[PDB]
Amino acid sequence: KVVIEPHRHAGVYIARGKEDLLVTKNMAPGESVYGEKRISVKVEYRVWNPFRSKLAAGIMGGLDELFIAPGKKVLYLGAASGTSVSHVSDVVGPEGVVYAVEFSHRPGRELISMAKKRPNIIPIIEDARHPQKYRMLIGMVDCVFADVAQPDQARIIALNSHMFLKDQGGVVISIKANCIDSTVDAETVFAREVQKLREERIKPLEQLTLEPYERDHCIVVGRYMRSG
């Protein structure tokens, strides 16, 4: 009744049924996080909403080289409520793991409850701005996702670039223009940001605006290249 279609990236499936949908192979079946539904074909499959998940806005926004895969290790700076990060745990499946970090304590309790259920997420509940307090427990991540509304994204991501990035690695930042500056134009603020990362050794590749989901958010996909 519903058929699947695999995506460019692993773990990502487009479900062609009564309506097309973005779905991921579940880790554990019959258990909800934020009241989403399900679909099976037996294999159990979990939706994302491109509204409530920014990376979901990326995948159906279309990004060529996302540096996620099953058997790897990803960093997630900004996992409030744990939704997209539990979903990223889903897409890296059993073998890979994610290190999520967070600072505000209400999504702190929410994410640590999802950590009680799901194993592949390992949570760090600190302010991101001093990475010594988690270089005691994290070692040599592969890829990095950064959705933090603070304006010094370049400083904090360059800090985690010098500390944990795998060489020739993959990094994805999200940018909210109406949070960093809130007066001027989107591509302008974006060019300034990627100038910052270029001076901070991160070689970008592409960026993309999330128009019919978000209000002037974009995402920048780049690499860490010959750098320490």
């Binding site: 995506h7 460019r8 009564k18 491109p50 926004g61 279309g62 960026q207 605006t209 128009e211």
Partner: protein, 143 residues
């Protein structure tokens, strides 16, 4: 007051069904899609096909870009006339629901102002010169 209650109840009903619709739905994206490179000759020589190594329609699709090597509907019953009909049916249902919601909230607001027009204070009737009828209360704090 009971009338305002009933209309409010049906308005929330339609709102929640619209939200469950928007949650179960799926749209398509169209944003600024930039790509960096290092040479201006290689830039002028860039071709999306010769970068993604996919087909015509796979290039032109953005929500799904699988390479040809990764490519390496029959159960779906009449996709020419039926499944597009059902997609359009779901989206038209959601549009209908939104329009219904707007109508309901309009009637609820008019009824709510009329219900507040009955309590207390000193009222004053103005005609907004576009042709609107409305009120304005005197500067008078109630006890």
């Amino acid at each position: 007051t009971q009338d305002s209650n009933y209309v409010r109840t049906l308005r929330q009903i339609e709102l929640k069904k619209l939200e469950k619709g928007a949650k179960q739905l799926m749209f398509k994206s169209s944003g600024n899609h930039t790509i960096f490179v290092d040479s201006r000759e290689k830039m002028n020589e860039f071709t999306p096909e010769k970068f993604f190594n996919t087909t015509s329609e796979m290039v032109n699709r953005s929500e799904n870009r699988l390479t040809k090597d990764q490519l390496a509907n029959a159960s779906s019953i009449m996709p020419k006339e039926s499944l597009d009909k059902k997609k359009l049916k779901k989206f038209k249902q959601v549009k209908q629901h939104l329009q219904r919601e707007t109508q309901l909230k309009q009637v609820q607001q008019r009824m709510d102002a009329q219900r507040e027009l009955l309590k207390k204070g000193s009222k004053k009737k103005i005609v907004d010169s576009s042709g609107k009828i409305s009120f304005k209360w005197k500067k008078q704090r109630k006890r």
